[PDB]
């Protein structure tokens, strides 16, 4: 599961770190790395979860 989240992150410029450290501050979200991939195969909606954390990175 984790290297697929890597692979969804490098098309977004992020790391695996800045996702999961982001999602702890973006929400306090629980997205349990299996079902994180189930948003990855709906990648149009996944990056709204990603770039929200990117805004919460800054």
């Amino acid at each position: 599961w984790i290297t697929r989240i890597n692979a969804a992150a490098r098309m977004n410029g992020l790391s695996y770190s800045r996702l999961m450290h982001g999602l702890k501050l973006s929400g306090i979200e629980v997205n349990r790395k299996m079902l994180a991939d189930l948003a990855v195969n709906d990648l149009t909606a996944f990056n709204q979860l990603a770039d929200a954390a990117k805004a919460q990175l800054n």
Partner: protein, 142 residues
């Protein structure tokens, strides 16, 4: 219940050029692409990679004294059968094994290793025969 893609993969053709970089860090992120670990549909066992063409391999560089130091040891089976080759020997005599052997260690071993290894090819100079597939241009992260 995940998605395990098996031979339903839209494969790709990237070209990574070898202008002036270090062949460790130039084989670094190529080797992830050879298994396609950058692709979101990564199964770990059905070769989700894509093909890689390297151009201008003989013009690749090394810092330190590695142009003379890193002797590439191959061995026969006959007794006392090592055959030493230095880097500058590999560089100018024939370098089309000089990036292959730097990735043969970096692709994982097994039957699937050589199956992913067929996706690689390296051309000396600017040959790039390959005018029938629309190859893409890739730039590494560093």
């Amino acid at each position: 219940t995940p998605m395990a893609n098996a031979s339903t993969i839209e494969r790709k053709w990237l070209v990574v050029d070898a202008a002036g970089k270090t062949l460790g860090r130039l084989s670094s992120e190529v080797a992830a692409i050879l298994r396609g670990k950058h692709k979101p549909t990564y199964t770990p066992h059905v070769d989700t990679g894509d093909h890689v063409i390297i151009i201008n391999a003989e013009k690749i560089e090394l810092t330190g004294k590695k142009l003379t130091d890193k002797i590439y040891y191959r061995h026969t089976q006959h007794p006392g059968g090592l055959k030493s080759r230095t880097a500058l020997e590999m560089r100018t005599n024939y370098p089309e094994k000089m990036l292959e052997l730097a990735i043969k260690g970096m692709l994982p071993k097994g039957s699937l290793g050589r199956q992913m290894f067929k996706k690689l090819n390296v051309y000396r100079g600017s040959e790039h025969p390959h005018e029938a597939q629309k190859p893409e241009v890739y730039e590494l992260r560093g």
